Amino acid sequence: MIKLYGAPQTRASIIQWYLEELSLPYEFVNVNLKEGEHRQAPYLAINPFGKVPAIADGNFHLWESGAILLYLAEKASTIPADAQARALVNQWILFANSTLANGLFIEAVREKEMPRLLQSLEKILGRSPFILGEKFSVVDVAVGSILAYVPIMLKLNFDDYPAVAAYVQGLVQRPAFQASIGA
Amino acid sequence: MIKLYGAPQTRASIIQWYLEELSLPYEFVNVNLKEGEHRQAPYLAINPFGKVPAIADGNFHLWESGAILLYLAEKASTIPADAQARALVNQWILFANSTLANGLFIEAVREKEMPRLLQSLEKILGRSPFILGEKFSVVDVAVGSILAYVPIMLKLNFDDYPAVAAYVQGLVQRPAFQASIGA
Ligand SMILES: N[C@@H](CCC(=O)N[C@@H](CS)C(=O)NCC(=O)O)C(=O)O
Ligand SMILES: N[C@@H](CCC(=O)N[C@@H](CS)C(=O)NCC(=O)O)C(=O)O
């Protein structure tokens, strides 16, 4: 089965949410970041940058939460996809991991970036229940996890963006979310 | 041919570098960020977040520099790849766009993060000429572009990381780099 390397209160919870959505068994391998386990040779052989999450799937190892999400989504796919279909998913995963996370969580750019990001997401989410349309996908795990951390880590809310607020509420209420990030 | 939406001194030059490495033609379209052209309706219809770069490949549009690099690499591939081969490239692109760029360019985390990132890259680059081994790849465009910006924006050098220094020196001297980022 997949082995997920993580620690409490890290982005490993985002991978646990997607594994819950996919109903896939996995082994959770705790890495003791407080005592520096991630900086020793055994963990550096899994991720040479000493960060969690990472996964092992047999002899295959992979790190970066976004790449893990794309990998699990590809492995679970039942209909073969082309470079353009994968590209639109990759676009949103890169967005969640860079443009969105940076604009919300970097204090020096937050005042300018955060309202613009939320205003753009309000337009998208006001026209469809999920980012890619009518159906929930790995894109909602990637983007939704970052938005869900806003009340958690910044004590801020989405009161001025009702469609974003309803979207995040809908995600937090999902049983798979409550079993992982929401636990 | 691909249309590339970009602007001076932006990550659009990273896409131009990879297009030149692939010997592909492209129609470059300047978006006047200084005059707010990226916030007008025509550009928001391409990237709703108003950021460059973006591409159009016929009717298909795509934004996030990382997603564009992965898309161009997939389209130019002659040997069909599976989920694991794509995952390894996805890992490095996500790393360049998040972990690496943040650890080097965010002042509050640079002191702790930068030496760890450079020490890990130094070990990899001391063993092979490029990140994935003997051959130059899209990963070298993604990671190498970020490393090449360090002297430019931080007034720092790679004197204590000789393999990183020689790797960056080699990339900057590439004709395709000179025709794009170095132009
Ligand atoms: N862009 C990476 C970031 C991973 C990351 O920063 N992980 C943290 C915990 S959430 C970590 O392992 N920190 C340990 C350290 O930096 O020493 C991802 O999304 O996977
Ligand atoms: N993660 C995005 C970042 C794109 C980005 O920040 N682009 C900048 C120029 S380098 C931009 O268009 N800024 C305009 C604005 O923020 O209003 C990517 O890699 O494409």
Residue numbers in the entry:
A (entry chain B), B (entry chain A): 1 to 183
Cite, word for word, the article reporting this structure.
Glutathione transferases (GSTs) constitute a widespread superfamily of enzymes notably involved in detoxification processes and/or in specialized metabolism. In the cyanobacterium Synechocsytis sp. GSTCs were shorter of about 30 residues compared to most cytosolic GSTs and had a well-conserved SRAS motif in the active site (10SRAS13 in SynGSTC1). The crystal structure of SynGSTC1 in complex with glutathione adopted the canonical GST fold with a very open active site because the α4 and α5 helices were exceptionally short.
We also solved the structures of two variants (S10T and R11A variants in complex with GSH) which did not show significant differences from the wild-type. This result was consistent with the crystal structure of S10T which was superimposable to the wild-type. Indeed, the GSH apparent affinity (Km) was not altered in the S10T variant. Indeed, the OG atom invariably retained the same orientation in all structures (wild-type and variants), and was hydrogen bonded to the main chains of A7 and A12. S10A remained effective even though the decrease was greater than for S10T, being divided by 10 and 1.2 in S10A and S10T, respectively, compared to WT.
